[PDB]
Paper text:
A highly specialized RNA polymerase with an outstanding accuracy is the [name]–adding enzyme (tRNA nucleotidyltransferase) that adds and maintains the triplet sequence C-C-A at the 3′–end of tRNAs. Recently, we could show that the [name]-adding enzyme from [name] (PhaCCA), a bacterium from the arctic permafrost growing at –15 °C, is such a cold-adapted enzyme and catalyzes [name]-addition in vitro down to 0 °C. Interestingly, both the N–terminal catalytic core as well as the C-terminal tRNA–binding region are adapted to the cold, indicating that the psychrophilic features are not restricted to a single protein domain, but are distributed over the whole enzyme. Our results reveal that a combination of individual strategies – a global flexibility in the tRNA-binding C-terminus as well as a thermal adaptation in the highly conserved catalytic core motif C controlling interdomain movements during [name]-addition – contribute to the remarkable cold adaptation of this unusual RNA polymerase. The crystal structures reveal a globally conserved scaffold with local adaptations to provide the structural plasticity compatible with catalysis at low temperature.
In order to investigate the structural properties of PhaCCA leading to cold adaptation, crystals of the corresponding recombinant enzyme were grown. The crystallized construct consisted of the [name] wild type sequence (377 amino acids) with an N–terminal extension of 43 residues including a 6xHis affinity tag. First crystals of PhaCCA were obtained in the presence of ammonium sulfate as crystallant and diffracted to a maximum resolution of 2.8 Å. They were used as seeds to screen for new conditions and led to crystals with similar cell parameters and symmetry but showing significantly improved diffraction properties (extending to a resolution of 1.8 Å) in the presence of PEG 3350 or diammonium hydrogen phosphate. All crystals showed a high solvent content (67%) with one enzyme monomer in the asymmetric unit. The refined structures are very similar, showing a root mean-square deviation (rmsd) ranging from 0.16 to 0.22 Å (for 370 superimposed Cα positions) when compared to the reference apo structure solved at the highest resolution. Their N–terminal extension is disordered and the first visible residue varied from position −4 to −2 at the end of the extension. The four C-terminal residues (HSHT) are also disordered, as well as the central part of the flexible loop (residues 82–93) in the head domain, except for the complex with CTP where it is clearly visible. PhaCCA is unambiguously monomeric in its crystalline state as well as in solution, as shown by SEC and SAXS analyses.
Residue numbers in the entry: -3 to 87, 93 to 373, 378
Write the structure that this text describes.
């Protein structure tokens, strides 16, 4: 935020005092020229990774093989990457000696700018003009950029909504010709880009481009993204886009399971879908489902109830508060432990959640001894 750019300027100054070239590069330059505050600030340098580690007290060496060292300084983290090009196999990183060799194989012209310590902008590919005209355009030959990393095709879509830009005609036609190549991309990278689209502004533009680019033809279950997105308003959670997608089509979670959801995200989607299929919600509904599930289900169905208050006013919040357990029932019934205990604990739990039976051991005992015997 208010400290990342300053810290990167310090990093650059330190790299240059050791005789290396260093520049701000990529998204930070784009954001600076748009008048936004960069979320990430990357530095490109002639220094190799181990030479960066010599110059800074605290570094994180995860991306070393790819040329990247994270520098920890003044409470920020600045990625320092040696000049490099990378290529993706259908199943490779090459360090280079000049900045321009690095820049000419980046994805889009607005991401292929560098800025010096003295605020001079190095813009070999017209990023400044494309930024002013709000155009996402591939650097150089779009066919080549997309053959290098087919995920860039979907990233163009994501950028169009993130920035409210159009996609350059030649670039878009190239995506259409190469959309088949999306099949080689790990579904985790695909899901990460789609999650961004779902929470970004102008997502209806992004979704139209997704279909227009032919990507929906070849994405995993890609045709499912061609719903009417007019009613969609993000709540800041990408999961709500996937739920909105399924709800519009009356489809179930299994239809999108190729994207490898976490067990938590899968549960939120399924339990929310179950809620949208329930005709009436009562105290049991608010007791058994989480508030996040009730809220997401209400959002896709357009309701605007005060869900938190209904849940808050139930007699109890969870099984933890129940005043009896299966061992009480074993005592009172004189029967051996078995699956029957779950049936009868739930009977008692329902009577308590509906406020019929008091949550009190002796009163539950009185009720149980009457109903069981």
């Amino acid at each position: 935020d208010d400290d990342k750019m300053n810290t990167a300027i310090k990093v650059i100054h330190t790299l240059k005092a050791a005789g290396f070239e260093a520049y701000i590069v990529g998204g930070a330059v784009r954001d600076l020229l748009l008048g936004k505050t960069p979320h990430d600030v990357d530095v490109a340098s002639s220094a190799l990774p181990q030479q960066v580690k010599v110059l800074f007290d605290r570094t994180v060496d995860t991306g070393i093989d790819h040329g990247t060292v994270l520098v920890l300084l003044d409470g920020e983290g600045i990625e320092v990457t040696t000049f490099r090009t990378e290529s993706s196999y259908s199943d490779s990183v090459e360090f280079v000696l000049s900045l321009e060799e690095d820049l000419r194989r980046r994805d889009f012209t607005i991401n292929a700018m560098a800025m010096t310590e003295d605020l001079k902008i190095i813009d070999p590919f017209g990023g400044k003009e494309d930024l002013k005209n709000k155009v996402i355009r591939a650097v150089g030959d779009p066919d080549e950029r997309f053959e290098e990393d087919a995920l860039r095709m979907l990233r163009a879509i994501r950028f169009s909504g993130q920035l409210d830009f159009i996609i350059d005609m030649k670039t878009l036609l190239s995506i259409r010709r190469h959309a088949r190549l999306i099949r080689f991309i790990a579904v985790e990278r695909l899901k990460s880009e789609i999650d961004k689209i779902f929470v970004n502004p102008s997502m209806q533009k992004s979704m139209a481009y997704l279909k227009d680019s032919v990507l929906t033809r070849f994405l995993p279950v890609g045709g499912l993204f061609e719903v009417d997105w007019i009613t969609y308003h993000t709540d800041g959670n990408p999961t709500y886009g996937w739920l909105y997608l399924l709800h519009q089509q009356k489809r179930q979670f299994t239809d999108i399971k190729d994207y490898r959801f976490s067990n938590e995200e899968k549960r939120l989607i399924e339990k929310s879908l179950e809620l949208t299929a329930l005709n009436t919600w009562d105290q049991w509904t608010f007791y058994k489902y989480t508030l996040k599930q009730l809220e997401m289900a209400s959002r896709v169905t357009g309701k605007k109830k005060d869900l938190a208050a209904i849940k808050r006013q139930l007699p109890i919040q969870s099984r933890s508060e129940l005043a009896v357990d299966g061992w009480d029932l074993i005592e009172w019934s004189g029967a051996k432990s078995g699956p029957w205990l779950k049936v009868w604990i739930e009977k008692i739990e329902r009577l308590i959640v509906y406020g019929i039976l008091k949550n009190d051991k002796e009163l539950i005992k009185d009720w149980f001894e009457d109903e069981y015997h």
